[PDB]
Design a protein around this ligand. Structure first.
Ligand SMILES: [Cl-]
Ligand code: NA
Length: 291
């Protein structure tokens, strides 16, 4: 137990990669090449003394993984189990940005992108970013929204990994600053256990600007995670959360195992579990002990 485990996943010939990585890396080093059939992924498993894993050692592994383009995971201890896995929606669970997609469907990509402009530049508050963009969409028919939702694409690996998450006794959640019409639809469409986001009322079949307060901002995404884990009696170390953006940091930093998915630079820097070059099939390494 004074041992640590790191899994490496790469498209490079695994023997070449092992060789190459021994030389660059340098106690006993145990390297075992293995194949996880369930996610059709051959990986390299390395066991090394826990002392070795240090902030300097992480930094270097990470930089190296970006130069040779591989993903890896430092096996958490303890491993999360019978817990929750929460996903942000936009650019995490789905590849797209829901509100941007609605905008483009409506000919308003410039207007909406501009509001995004002001908030990112720090000129505007994120809640006011959300309200403004929603305000621009007043009158959109339920059917346009549903159609937009229909053409959204699941992020890679989720079809494979979702049934496994369930088989491993985890609850799934979406927690997001997006629209409830999308969030609920995604939940029902994929059998997710929970789903929470902002709520914008739809009346007479068109989008209103009646937004449920308080708005689901970054701190509220965390708080929803906390409250859900409380309700389910789930310890923090058994909470996995995945996200790509700054409004995900509080939630990912709170989770026992926070995962940055193809994330923004500011997220890649605080969150050290990452998926950068493969899909969500890789969550296996954080929930299956027998690897
Ligand atoms: Cl949004
Ligand atoms: Na996101």
């Amino acid at each position: 137990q004074s041992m640590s485990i790191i899994y490496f996943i790469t498209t490079q010939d695994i023997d070449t990669f092992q060789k190459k990585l021994q030389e660059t890396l340098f106690f006993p080093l145990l390297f075992d090449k293995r194949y996880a059939a369930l996610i059709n992924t051959a990986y390299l498993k390395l066991t090394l003394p826990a002392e070795c894993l240090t902030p300097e050692f992480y930094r270097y592994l990470r930089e190296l993984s970006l130069q040779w383009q591989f993903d890896f995971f430092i096996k958490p201890q303890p491993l999360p189990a019978n817990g929750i896995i929460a996903f942000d929606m936009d650019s995490t669970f789905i590849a797209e940005e829901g509100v941007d997609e609605i905008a483009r469907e409506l000919g308003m990509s410039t207007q909406i992108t501009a509001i995004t402009q002001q908030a990112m530049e720090g000129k505007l508050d994120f809640n006011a970013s959300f309200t403004r963009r929603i305000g621009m969409l007043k009158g959109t028919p339920k059917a346009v929204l549903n159609a937009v939702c229909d053409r959204m694409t699941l992020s890679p690996g989720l079809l494979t990994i979702l049934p496994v998450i369930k088989a491993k006794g985890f609850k799934t959640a979406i927690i997001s600053g997006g629209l409830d019409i999308f969030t609920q639809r995604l939940k029902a469409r994929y059998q997710l256990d929970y789903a929470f986001s902002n709520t914008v009322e739809i009346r007479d079949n068109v989008l209103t600007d009646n937004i449920t307060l308080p708005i689901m901002n970054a701190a509220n995404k965390k708080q929803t995670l906390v409250d859900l884990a409380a309700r389910l009696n789930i310890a923090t170390e058994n909470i996995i959360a995945c996200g790509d953006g700054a409004n995900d940091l509080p939630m990912l930093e709170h989770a026992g195992t926070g995962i940055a998915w193809k994330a923004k630079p500011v997220v890649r820097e605080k969150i050290h579990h990452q998926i950068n070059y493969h899909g969500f099939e890789l969550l296996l390494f954080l929930i299956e002990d027998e690897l």
